[PDB]
Amino acid sequence: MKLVMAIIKPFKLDEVREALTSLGIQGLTVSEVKGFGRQKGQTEIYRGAEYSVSFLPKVKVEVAVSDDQYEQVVEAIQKAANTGRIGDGKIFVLDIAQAVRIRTGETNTEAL
Amino acid sequence: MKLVMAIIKPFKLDEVREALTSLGIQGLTVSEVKGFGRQKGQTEIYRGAEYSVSFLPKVKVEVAVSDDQYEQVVEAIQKAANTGRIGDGKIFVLDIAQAVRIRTGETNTEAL
Amino acid sequence: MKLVMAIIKPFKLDEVREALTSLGIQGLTVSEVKGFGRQKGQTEIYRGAEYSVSFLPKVKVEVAVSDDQYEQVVEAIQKAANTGRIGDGKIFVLDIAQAVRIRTGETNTEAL
Ligand SMILES: Nc1ncnc2c1ncn2[C@@H]1O[C@H](COP(=O)(O)OP(=O)(O)O)[C@@H](O)[C@H]1O
Ligand SMILES: Nc1ncnc2c1ncn2[C@@H]1O[C@H](COP(=O)(O)OP(=O)(O)O)[C@@H](O)[C@H]1O
Ligand SMILES: Nc1ncnc2c1ncn2[C@@H]1O[C@H](COP(=O)(O)OP(=O)(O)O)[C@@H](O)[C@H]1O
Known about the structure:
By secondary structure, chain A is of the alpha+beta class. The first copy, chain A, has helices spanning 13-22, 70-81, and strands at residues 2-8, 28-36, 43-45, 50-52, 56-65, 90-101. In chain A, helix 1 (13-22) runs antiparallel to helix 2.
């Protein structure tokens, strides 16, 4: 099991859920985040301090898939979230030790 | 050390913090998220595009516990977050390589 | 590769991004969260239920760095986020199995 964590542009999310659905992935969990990177917001200095005046929204997609699916999931998200412009974002893969589906108690692959 | 990540229904959170407190867990960190799964929101098509018009709020509980507590923490959250209805959510367990408490520099178990 | 996850006080974020920038870290991802711990919000009881009436905002910094940088990143964040008062927060380190930069397909260290 893996937790694929993808930090994408908020407008690429419909296309991302689509690819994932084309792969057979039942569901996912989404978070709103602010991004900092090469592409940065505007700053302002006021009284010896520099304050951020604009922010770069991103969407964090967090999806648990099996060891047989993650590599395909990574590739799918990469292709689905790509624009070719700076700020496209990241995909990180972390290892899931255990998984539980709260409704049924199902574990491992059956929890996803 | 483990990071227990639980994606639950937002109204089951008071009951979840309670169980965790009954286990001796000092604290936790909570995030607001949108869920997608079997239980889905409503959609709308407008001009060759399908837009989501309703969303399913979930709460993400993120709690670091020791290797001697995580299995009990998982079980507690599972029982505390269960309703028996579709959408109860997930619990994922990931491995924590290092931990630091910012205030005191305490590490490992003493950081939690 | 590691995902350094730091749960800090929201006003220590400018100082945190600064240290990270002094270390050569290109970017990071930030989330708004609620904290529960020793330092707690106010509660209220109404009709046989206890409701939370105040909340403790925290900022979650999530930054992927290489195996040669993480220990320095942890230390930097610890020093940059420290106040000496209760509620300073946590830093957790998790292992990243794979990394992809969506724009270019670059992997591993080149993805960060
Ligand atoms: N070290 C990092 N850890 C976690 N997320 C990052 C990191 N660097 C960048 N990001 C995320 O990637 C997004 C894009 O960063 P940017 O460098 O502007 O473009 P690109 O990813 O195309 O190089 C950022 O807004 C940020 O959310
Ligand atoms: N593959 C997944 N990865 C991460 N979170 C998921 C995944 N599948 C479902 N979830 C989360 O679990 C919640 C419940 O999903 P759903 O399938 O509707 O009910 P159940 O979990 O009872 O089967 C979703 O709203 C979503 O937040
Ligand atoms: N077990 C835990 N798992 C994840 N985050 C935690 C945990 N315990 C505390 N935190 C986070 O650390 C913050 C500070 O907790 P608190 O105990 O009040 O102060 P301190 O970290 O200085 O002991 C909390 O608001 C919470 O967000």
